């Protein structure tokens, strides 16, 4: 088989721990999933690839940690709460820095515009216009709406990432 490194960043409460739980087998799944403390490292298999997955916390307090994995990471999944119109900019800043860093290589970035089910959700075109993804011109990137709770879209997404990771 072949193993590759995927880092999962995103503001607090965007549903990173939920989105990775839908990549885990239905029996190995946790019922009620908890606010990630520090960080958590699962392994998930999808095709020829075996993902080394890094789930960070998003609360300000721990963001100082994302920088720790930027060197080894082969791909970044960036998760965004679609109901939090407020902290959209704060997401942008954190994302800008992450790209800006000297250790984060020009790897593929899959952006989940999660929580599409919420009524007030922000639509995949407004979200990427806030985050300014149109500017990102050096790496492969794609935004995908989703529902972490259900796994909806999560397939559509990881499938994409796995493609350019092969």
């Amino acid at each position: 088989s072949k193993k590759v490194n995927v880092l999962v960043v995103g503001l607090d409460n965007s549903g990173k721990t939920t989105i990775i739980e839908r990549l885990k087998p239905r029996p190995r799944q946790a019922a009620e999933v908890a606010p990630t403390v520090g960080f958590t490292v699962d392994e998930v298999e999808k095709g020829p690839l075996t993902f080394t997955v890094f789930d960070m916390s998003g609360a300000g307090r721990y963001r100082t940690l994302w920088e720790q994995y930027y060197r080894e990471a082969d791909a970044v999944v960036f998760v965004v709460d679609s109901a939090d119109k407020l902290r959209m900019v704060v997401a942008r800043d954190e994302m800008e820095h992450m790209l800006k860093h000297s250790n984060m290589r020009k790897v593929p970035i899959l952006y989940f515009a999660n929580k599409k089910d919420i009524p007030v959700a922000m639509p995949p075109v407004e979200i990427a216009q806030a985050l300014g993804l149109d500017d990102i011109k050096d790496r492969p990137w794609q935004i995908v709406p989703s529902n972490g709770l259900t796994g909806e879209g999560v397939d559509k997404g990881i499938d994409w990432l796995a493609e350019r990771l092969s």
Binding site: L11, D12, N13, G60, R63, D84, K85, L86, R87, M88, V89, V90, D93, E94, H97, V120
Partner: protein, 309 residues
């Protein structure tokens, strides 16, 4: 020089007509994400959650100030209809016959955030009544010579506490641990704002001078402003930055961010700001709330990475 802030979201058309003492954020409901509470001049009590308005409520009178002890508590006349997530809970009234000038909070013992809380009130009679951690009753009635224009609390109710009081006469008075000082500082004009900083108190007089005062009476620094003072507020970043700043907004439209003697950020709202709040609102900790004379609400946020050094 430049502005340090991130521009969160902007609502040009909120209904809000209020000044600083009638604005507040707290965790009334408890779902982590904090709410903005405003006692409008509509005699309406608007509530904002995140990027949107959530509720409106009716206010019996036009309000004087609102605080929180998770229990909101508007003041008006001689009554204080302290609501509580979110329906009436008392109608505590002042024993002698009094009108309320000002109101603020005090830490009960922990002197730390999100702890037990004791409500405090100034009275036009000339008293400052500190009350119970259930708002139950007057805990220390201190009668003081002048009409209180505004007040600031630094400390803890159990450990130790110093309260600074700007009177309408243009004098600054002190009370340490329930005990009143006979130290009286004479101001240059009648006071416009009062901020608890790091190791001193900040007065803004009408002649566009901010002044820093230590409980002793030493004058640390003086800020000399190009226009007129409309707003002042304690901006308190905790963490590896740990600065306890001062934002001051002026009618020329700028909002300045002094870190002690030094200017750190200036931006300009299209209409003059009348209200300033810095704190956790939404899920982000360092957020600036402004209510302008055009009745618009502006939310700005302080990057993790910004140095105020």
């Amino acid at each position: 020089v430049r502005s340090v802030w991130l521009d969160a979201f902007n609502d040009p058309v909120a209904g809000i007509s209020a000044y600083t003492p009638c604005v507040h954020t707290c965790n009334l409901f408890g779902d982590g994400e904090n709410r903005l509470v405003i006692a409008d001049e509509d005699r309406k009590l608007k509530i904002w959650k995140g990027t949107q308005k959530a509720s409106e409520h009716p206010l019996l009178d036009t309000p004087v100030a609102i605080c929180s002890y998770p229990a909101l508590a508007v003041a008006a006349g001689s009554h204080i209809y302290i609501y509580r997530n979110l329906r009436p809970y008392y109608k505590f009234v002042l024993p002698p016959e009094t009108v309320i000038t000002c109101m603020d909070v005090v830490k009960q013992a922990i002197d730390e955030p999100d702890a037990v809380s004791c409500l405090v009130v100034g009275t036009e009679s000339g008293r400052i009544l500190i009350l119970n951690p259930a708002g139950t009753a007057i805990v220390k009635n201190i009668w003081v010579g002048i009409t209180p224009a505004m007040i600031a609390v630094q400390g803890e109710l159990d450990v130790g506490y110093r309260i600074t009081v700007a009177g309408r006469d243009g004098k600054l008075y002190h009370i340490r641990n329930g005990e009143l000082s006979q130290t009286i500082i004479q101001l240059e004009a009648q006071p416009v704002g009062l901020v608890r900083l790091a190791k001193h108190v900040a007065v803004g007089c009408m002649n566009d001078v901010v002044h820093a005062y230590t409980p002793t009476g030493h004058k640390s620094w003086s800020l000399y402003l190009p226009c007129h003072i409309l707003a002042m507020q304690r901006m308190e970043v905790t963490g590896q930055r740990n600065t306890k700043a001062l934002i001051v907004a002026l009618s020329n439209g700028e909002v300045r961010v002094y870190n002690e003697k030094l200017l750190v950020s200036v931006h300009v709202s299209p209409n003059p700001v009348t209200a300033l709040w810095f704190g956790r609102y939404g899920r982000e900790d360092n957020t600036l709330l402004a209510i302008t004379k055009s009745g618009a609400l502006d939310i700005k946020m302080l990057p993790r990475t910004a140095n105020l050094e």
